[PDB]
Structures are given as C-alpha cells and as structure tokens.
Amino acid sequence: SHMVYLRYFKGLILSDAYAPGLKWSDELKAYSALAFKYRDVRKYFLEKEIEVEENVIDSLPFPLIKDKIELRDYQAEAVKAWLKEKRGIIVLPTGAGKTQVALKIVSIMKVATLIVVPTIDLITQWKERINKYLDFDPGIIGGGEDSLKGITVITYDSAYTRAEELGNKFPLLIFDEVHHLPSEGYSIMAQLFASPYRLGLTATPERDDGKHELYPILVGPIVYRKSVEELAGKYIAKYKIKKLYVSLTNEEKKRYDGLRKKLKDFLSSRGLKLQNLDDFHRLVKLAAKDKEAREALLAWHESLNIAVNSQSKIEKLREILQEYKNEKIIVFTRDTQMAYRISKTFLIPVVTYKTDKDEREEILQKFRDGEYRVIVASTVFDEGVDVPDATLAIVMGGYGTKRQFLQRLGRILRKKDKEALLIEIVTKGTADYRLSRRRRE
Ligand SMILES: [Cl-]
Ligand SMILES: [Cl-]
Ligand SMILES: [Cl-]
Ligand SMILES: [Cl-]
Ligand SMILES: [Cl-]
C-alpha cells in the first residue's frame, strides 16, 4: 500500500524512499544514513503526508519514579526552553544544578533514558542523584558494572563499544560534559543513536578546535545559556571601580550639620526612623499637612544635595585630573549645577541635557578627535545611538554604583576595557557615604 518501510539497522536508519539527508546504497537495497537522522526523516514523511511503517525504536520500559525535584527559577526556565525542540544543549555555570534540570526533564518525558558521562567518577554522582531525586536506582554500564535499565548511566567509552546495540533503545539521550562529544571516536558514536530526544549539558560549550561546530549533528544547538551573573540578576563590570573619600568643606559642614540637627530634632519629637522605608513615606505623608515636618523633609533633601555636590569633590578631581593627565576622561554628576562648577574650575567643556545636539555632537567629536582630554556631562545619553567611548570615567555622587547606570557606562567606558578605571567620589561621614553603600542596587 502507501506505507514506506523505516527501520533501524546496526546504527543506521533504513528507508524504502528518499528523504533529505539520505543516500542510496545498492548494498542494502535502501536509502540510508546514520540513525541520528531518524527524527527528521520521520517528521518529513509525516509533513509530506506519506504514511510510514516503523520498526525503528525498541525502547526499554520506563520505571516507576517519584519526582522530588523542586526547580529554581532559572532551572525551570531551562527545562521549558529545552522542551520546545527537545534537542539541544543547556549551558549553565557549574554549581548551578545542571543535574536536577536534566532529571526533571527525565521525569517529565517518561521515556527510557540513557545518560552518557565521560568519567567513572561522574557515574557514581549521577547514580546518587537519580536515587535521590527520582527515587530510582539506575542501570550502570561502566566501572565494571553492566546492568541495563529503563534509566541507565553509561560512560562515553562504553557507549562507543555498545553504540550499535543501544542506538535504538533509549528515546531520550543525555550527554553530560557534552563538549567532550565532538572529540575523536565519540563524534561518530552519537550519530548512531536514533534517539529522537537529545540533551547536552555543559558549562563550557566552546572548544579551541572549534569542533563544537558539530553540535547540530550530534545533540542539537544551544537552547539555553546563562552566565552566573545573568542567573543572579546582577551585572558585573569588566572595568575596575575605585572609591575616593573626600570630606566636606568647613562651610559645607556647618550648614550640613545644621540641617541635620533640624531633621533629627524633628524625628525625636515624632519618633521616626530616617533609615526605614515606610517611616520615610510617613514623613512625606505628614509633610503635606504640617509645615514643621515639611521643613524637616526639605532639610533632609538639602543635606544630601550638599554632600552629593560638595566642593571637596571638585578639590579632589584636581588631584586626579593631573595623575591621569587628560587621558580621554568622562566626569558625571546627576546635578546640573555641579557640571558647571567643575567646568569653570578646570576649564573643561560641558555636556549637559540642555545643549544643542549639533553642539553635543561637535563637543563629543572633539572628544573623538583627541582635542579634549576631559569632558563633563551631568545628564547621560539614554536611548542614544552615539554612545561616547573613553579610557576613564568619574562620577561625583554615591549614585554611581547604581546598576542601570553601570551597564550604560560599560559599553561607553572602554573600546578595550583593560581594567580601564571608573572612579567615583563620595563625601565621607554623610548621606552621600550611605547612598554609596545603599543596598537597593
Ligand atoms: Cl574515568
Ligand atoms: Cl545533591
Ligand atoms: Cl580530539
Ligand atoms: Cl577532548
Ligand atoms: Cl541607612
């Protein structure tokens, strides 16, 4: 009738009719390829609406399991990523629990599984984790053992020895340390397995010989990759970061201290924590009904503006501006005024938000030429194509450690960030200090 015959034979896929990636062998009297092709050859005949008689997979039976795996946020992401195609590599730093990601996939899929590991030490490990998380004692091929089971852990070397026999036995095939797989001997071994579902795991998918270019014919592409940074939701910067502590000028201290006692004596009467988030919201709420609080709130706000914009920071910037000798620098501050005073003190040009773009472009291109070896902008380019690039960056408040800002500095700070420096100046003993160590991130 209509039925094409599709069969496994000693590590090969054998078909009556052509399908892409097949080739005809007079010897077998059939079209054939390495049995990796099985999924695509099956799918294609289905998509081309041709009906197929199939003697390809002879699956071992999947055991009863008790899944005890509670996945982390990223772990579960991975699983979901994988399940789209069910044929690919999941990259995650070591320590991040690759094993549990894989065993969850095993738990979901409920099909016989071969987990291939490069070392006998890793056998023992997977043995232990499968017992722990799936409540099943797997079969072991390697280390002197040879028991075959619905879930089986095997060495790369033994898989090679056993490739033809085991090629159509496990629908799900998992390679641990999958960067080993493209090596000599191993690379051929994987292509004999008809296994439709394939999963690789590694922290280090790239190889120097670049033989990782093969992954698509062995396991599948990378379908999920995440740095340690990316998992924690932190940003890490290539450059160095240097804190420099100025102290207030003696004029600034006196008014600072004044405003502070005004805020403090208010919170003595009303009993608020300056350091608490809801006690702050209380103050602001009480400020729109009471003048006394409102003076206390506005004192608080000013005491910061003093410390954040302290002259002493301009006085240290003089010391720094000589040591780094006008080597393509950018100085930052969120306060518009503080741009201008630094601008005037050192004879540096200013890049502010209220500047013509033809003026902002011309001053930056004069930076680009090497004419100006220092420049200041209080505002920063946001959603902005012409990101300036330069050796050194200075930030004039403790708000320089904010993460949204740091990543903007990252692309801009270095063309080659050879531990290229970012310094920030911070007023000792003040609300500027504390902002610089403000946990928010
Ligand atoms: Cl070994
Ligand atoms: Cl564990
Ligand atoms: Cl090799
Ligand atoms: Cl190798
Ligand atoms: Cl605090």
The answer to whether residues 393 and 422 touch, using CB atoms and an 8 Å cutoff, is yes
Distance CA 39, CA 35 (A): 9
Task: Write phi, then psi, for 61 (nearest 5 degrees).
Answer: -85, 140
Tokens found for residue 227: 């740095």
- Strands lying side by side in the sheet with 421-427: 240-246, 421-427, 392-395, 329-332, 374-377
The CATH 3.40.50.300 portion of the chain extends over 59-234, 235-441
Could you tell me how many residues make up the chain? Answer: 441
Round the CA-based radius of gyration of the chain to a whole number and report it. Answer: 32
Ligand 5 midpoint to CA 195 (Å): 58
Q: Phi, psi (5° rounding) for residue 436?
A: -70, -25
Resolution, expressed in angstroms to one decimal: 3.0
Sign of the four-CA dihedral 432, 434, 437, 438: negative
- Cα diameter, the chain: 99
d(CA 131, CA 137): 5
Residue 103 CB neighbours (<10 A) = 27
163 is in an annotated binding site: no
- For residue 299, say whether it is annotated as part of any ligand binding site: no
Residue 102 CB coordination number (10 Å): 28
Ligand 3 mean position to 184 CA, how many Å? 4
CA of residue 396 relative to chain centroid, distance: 29
Residue 220 labeled ligand binder: no
Domain topology for 235-441: Rossmann fold (3.40.50)
Q: How far apart (Å, rounded) are the C-alpha atoms in residues 367 and 390?
A: 9
Residues 93 and 360: their CA atoms lie apart, in Å, by 43
Can you list the positions of beta strands (E) in 234-346? 240-246, 329-332
99 is in an annotated binding site: yes
Annotation-wise, does 95 bind a ligand?
yes
Residues linked to residue 88 through DSSP beta bridges, in sequence order: 199
- CATH 3.40.50.300 for domain 59-234: yes
First to last CA, the chain: 68
User: Annotated binding residue at 161?
Assistant: no
- Quote the ligand 3 centre to 206 CA distance (angstroms): 13
Distance (Å) from CA 439 to ligand 5 centroid: 9
Expressed in angstroms and rounded, the spacing between residue 176 Cα and the centre of ligand 3 is 17
Ligand 1 mean position to 35 CA, how many Å?
27
CA–CA gap between residue 28 and residue 157 (Å, rounded): 29
CB-CB contact of 41 with 54 (8 Å): no
Tokens of 169: 């036995």
Residue type for position 391: T
Which one-letter DSSP state was computed for residue 330?
Answer: E
What are the DSSP E strand ranges found in 203-336?
A: 222-225, 240-246, 329-332
> DSSP class of residue 350?
B
CA dihedral (342, 378, 305, 275) in degrees, to 10, reads -140
Token readout for 418 is 């050879």
Which one-letter DSSP state was computed for residue 3?
A: P
**DSSP helix/strand/coil, 6:** strand
Q: Which ligand is nearest to the CA of 179?
A: 4
Q: At what angle do helices 250-270 and 277-287 cross, to 10 degrees?
A: 90
Which of left, alpha, beta for 142 (phi over 0: left; psi -120 to 50: alpha)? Answer: left
Phi-psi region of 110 (alpha: psi -120 to 50; beta: other; left: phi over 0): left
Task: Take residue 69 and report the two structure tokens written for it.
Answer: 């795996």
- Do the Cβ atoms of 307 and 432 come closer than 8 Å? yes
